[PDB]
């Protein structure tokens, strides 16, 4: 939408949780589990491929 403006990635993930109706404390208080789940989900794609 213009020039790239940097933001830390967990804070971008919190904006995106807001965009679906969940408060952002739910992301910050679960950060490690959410990242573990994303990593297992990405590791399952290359296994199916």
């Amino acid at each position: 939408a213009g020039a790239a403006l940097q933001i830390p990635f967990a804070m971008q993930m919190a904006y995106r949780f807001n965009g679906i109706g969940v408060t952002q404390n739910v992301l910050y208080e679960n950060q490690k589990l959410i990242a573990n789940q994303f990593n297992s989900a990405i590791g399952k794609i290359q296994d199916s491929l």
């Binding site: 939408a1 213009g2 020039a3 403006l5 940097q6 933001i7 830390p8 967990a10 804070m11 919190a14 904006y15 408060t23 952002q24 404390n25 910050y28 208080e29 950060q31």
Partner: protein
């Protein structure tokens, strides 16, 4: 709100014009400009409680902390009407110490 469906930027409004066998759309959009960098933090710890912005981000100009809206820089001081509380400050990665100002009790002298 569909990205790039009505031009580049944040769609404000669009005007139609007729062409021969066709149509022309003049899209008016909003484009952000002249950014500055800041230090930032996800929450703020005060009295053993974690505070999150209601809307906006916590930013630091070098020595002081403010809340701003995310798309236009307009800094304000962090109060209990700017933020909400959840939990204690032991679980959030990158939490920062600052004071969150209450209006009522300095009204009550």
């Amino acid at each position: 709100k569909r990205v790039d469906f009505c031009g580049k930027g944040y769609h404000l409004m669009s005007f139609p014009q007729s062409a021969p066998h066709g149509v022309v759309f003049l899209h008016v959009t909003y484009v952000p400009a002249q950014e500055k960098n800041f230090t930032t933090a996800p929450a703020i710890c005060h009295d053993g409680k974690a505070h999150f912005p209601r809307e906006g981000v916590f930013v630091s100009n070098g020595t002081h902390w403010f809340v701003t809206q995310r798309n236009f820089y307009e800094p304000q001081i962090i109060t209990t009407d700017n933020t909400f509380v959840s939990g204690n400050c032991d679980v959030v990665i990158g939490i920062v110490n600052n004071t969150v100002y209450d209006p009522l009790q300095p009204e009550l002298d």
